[model samples]
Target: MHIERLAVDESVGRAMPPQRFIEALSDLGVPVEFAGEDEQFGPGDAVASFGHRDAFLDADWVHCIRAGYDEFPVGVYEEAGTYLTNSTGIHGTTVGETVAGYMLTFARRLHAYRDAQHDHAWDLPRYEEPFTLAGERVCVVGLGTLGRGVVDRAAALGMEVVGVRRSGDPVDNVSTVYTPDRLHEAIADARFVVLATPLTDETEGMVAAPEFETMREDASLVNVARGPVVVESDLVAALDSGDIAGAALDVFSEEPLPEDSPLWDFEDVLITPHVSAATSKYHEDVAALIRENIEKIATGDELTNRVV
Candidate 1:
């Protein structure tokens, strides 16, 4: 009585994906028992510890034959469409009209105008057209998932999109690409520098005092990626003395930003809690992963997105 185990992730709107994968494996002489999402999945007949009985780990279960990512390479990013689309092998792509919308919000002074609406100032210039993205120079760091998205949006806005990556491989959509070592050389003349990289070992605290010193006096910056890529104390100092004109930061080194931080008091600086990709359709689309799970169970026989 050998039993195989498949830990179906609850992402399919069920506690698991109907145990079809487990069943299929079982039919093939691999009798499977399901171990909940967090429960261990390995080769044995004993059920593992999941405090709940029916909610999950309801099945029975296994040993660590191997662990999987469900196609997640780095936890920071995962593919869009799941097993259903494995037939064509098309990676899920998104049309980034949202970040573009943010650029326009800055360009047209929309949010500021909305904020000032309390005062009944209808003039656009009173908010006075915050800043023009047209013809601005931008440096995109880290050419991964979100970096490419930001590059596309920047290019669409008539801004020169420059990539600051380690590979120096000439990312697909950017006006120019620069290495991390040459960031100063790149930021020397640019108007906007976008830190779209991750917070990895090499890049942590990469943008410190010297990084700010490289930029022109009136240049602005936007960071829509993870925090710790830039140093807050140095950035605050730069903002205080106008080393950099302003910053539109979606991500930050620290969040809920302290009231005591001088950055909160800057007029030129704008801060948001890392929502560059947020859209009205976010949760709705996340809920839509169910369809992919169904298609995966029905026809997604092979492991398509197995990164491991």
Candidate 2:
């Protein structure tokens, strides 16, 4: 009933050589089979799924490669008696670096400088003063792995860190912490507000018109979390009205960001293709993390990063 046999969908298996994955599983006394490799396995006893829904069938355990599982069918897995473990702690450093980069871009006006490059213009005298992050405040909307990563880096750079979590408990490197009930108060004086919260009923449209109005006019918003966490229309309106300085958005409500979307036309807005956490180390790290899961399951120890 434990992970004696592990099924790795071709999607996840393709990241590393099949032989390498097989060797790792063999060392743990867990045989490995690719999803399409054989019919007898019937999804095997456990799976490291990379968007492989069919692999959930009869599988006792499913380990998701991605940190966020909002798109996953949890009900189906629960009904099948499947235990799910998400890759939560893995993406912290990369995502935190991205948010830090965004903060620096705004503070140094790097985004505007990039635009000036396209025009081949040198309007140095026209440029105004650039702010320093040393005394500024950074509000991390979610104090999970992603938020902690941002807090560590932001605090290291001498920025005061304010964090918001459901529990409101203080986190390392954070000067102050607030509960979701005090969301507006947590971000009111922040120069950079980073969104790292997971997508849920409580977080959907969490940053809307009312929240935007309460923010400082010079503040910038960085969204590394799900797109639904911000009301896209309200964000556009906020940018247009100068309710906030600008925004660095990695996730959008729509994938690929429609060419017709007004967000693209804003001079102050910085948009990326949702690659905040993309890194070359993903496959290597996931391979090791998965092996740990195997060891825990085989030894009858608690699984790491279990979301459900």
Candidate 3:
């Protein structure tokens, strides 16, 4: 569990400056070295990296800055006996706020108003088109840290909150908990269906045509999780048929969401370049996680948020 050296790589593509990580670690007496994109690492080295790197596989421990680590070769780390940890719990606030923003934009017709304003047209939504979040229902899938964050905000806004998770266990601020198998029932009456689950074998494409069919026609989709969790083709079909009202997508199956993608042309689809977790405190949050895991490793305790 001893870490001989720690390295920080800025090539992970996140907006966080590498110097922030180095400064944070240095404050805790943990020396950090700069790692180049193609640098080699060894068994005694630990790396704090953002994106996947083949060179990082050789390290004793790897701390991924992002919450989702599905892109990493977890089996290789397991087979190589290398530790893998991710910053999962830290994204609750930023992502939760973004989800709230999405729902608010839809309910108040803010997106439409913004479009009108750009054209110098003082347009207002139909009386029935503008609604409030106070009496709406929200079904948040994946009752993990991110899900709970959504629940807290949704409940505080006077929205009825339900959740879906593997365990079907009770969660605070949620009125009902549904197992993944009952996903259709959970989302049937929801006004806003939020996806916060991690992308895994079981979760990939979990939401498709059937699930969309079960949703209310006025309901909207909010995806803050990985793009593959919902089938893109099925979602498009649902939107085309008006099976669901709209969608606010922050993630997509492909990054940079090809210019030709139809999602861009849909008036009801609000797209962001996968920045739900972007915040000025990103580096500090990951640094705190790194510090905790480092201390745990030094004390012969379990590492926080260890995935492998």
Candidate 4:
């Protein structure tokens, strides 16, 4: 289990770990090297990469910096008998705050005010349009790490929180926990329907026309999960039909959202280029996970956040 050498590969259009990551690895007495894009790995090597790479399969162990590992071939890694881990637990604070920010923006009409400022007009939303987060209902789908993060903050803000999960287990701060089958019922009366579920067979396109129809007309959709979780076209149609009030989308079906995408033209749609989890401490967080896994490997204990 001793790692003779560790390789840190360059990330594609993403921030690579800072010097502190290297220094931390070096402090552990593990020799670390900056790996080239086409670098080859071996059984004695361990790697930490921002995204999936075929070369990673040749290593004894690999850590994916991103929380989502759907890009990595889990079956292939299992076949190769290579150990895999990922950065999963670090996103709660960043994503939770982002979701809360979206809700606050809608509640306070901040986006509309910003638009008015651009037009040099002192426009105001109708009195009924401006609302408060407190006393509002938020139905968060997927009570995982990120979902719980949203729940904690929403509850602290005095919002009534409900959740939908596969387990339907009771969660603190959540008034009710609905199973996946009851998704429509859970979101029916919610003022904010926050999606925090992972993209999978059952979850992809989970929110479509029917789900939108079930939502309250004044409600807003906040998607902090993967893009495919909600059908983009359906969302557009829903917006057109006024099925729901608006949406704040961080992730999209396509990155960069295409120049001709209609989502950009929607006044009520707030788009953030998939940066809900972006933070200054990202590298430090991943580095801590890497350090912990290295120590676990040395002690022959179970690895934290192991994917394979």
lDDT of the structure predicted as candidate 1: 0.56
Off by over 4 Å in 1: 1-102, 111-115, 122-131, 283-305
Best-fitting candidate, scored by TM-score: 4
Q: What is the C-alpha lDDT of each candidate?
A: 0.56, 0.82, 0.89, 0.89
What does candidate 3's lDDT look like per residue over 1-308, in tens digits? 67888899875446577777687788654568888877888767889888788878788899888777877899988988988998879888998999999999998898998889889999867778989999899999999999988999999899999989999989999999999999999999999999999888999999999999999999999999989999999999999999998999999999989999888878888999998888887878888888888788888999888899
Residue-level lDDT of model 4, residues 74-142, one tens digit each, is: 999999999999889889899999999999999998998999999899986897888899999999999
> By the lDDT metric, which is better: model 1 or model 4?
4
RMSD of each: 8.6, 2.9, 2.4, 2.1
**What is the TM-score (0 to 1) of candidate 4?**
0.92
- What stretches of model 4 exceed 4 Å from their correct place? 17-26
The alpha-carbon deviation from the true structure for residue 171 of candidate 3, after best TM-score superposition, in angstroms, is: 1.3
Sort by TM-score, best first: what order?
Answer: 4, 3, 2, 1
Kindly state the number of residue pairs that clash in model 3.
Answer: 0
The ten-residue window of minimal lDDT in model 4 covers 12-21
Per-residue CA lDDT of model 2 for 90-143, tens digit only, reads 888888888889888878878878888999988562345487799999999999
Candidate 1 lDDT over 1-308, as tens digits, reads: 23343343434322123344344334332333544455533332322221222222222221111122233223222231211211111111232344555556666666667667888877556443467888877777767756787777778779887878887888776867888888888788777777767577898888878878888877767776566888988999999887887777777767877678777666567777655554444323332332233334446343333321
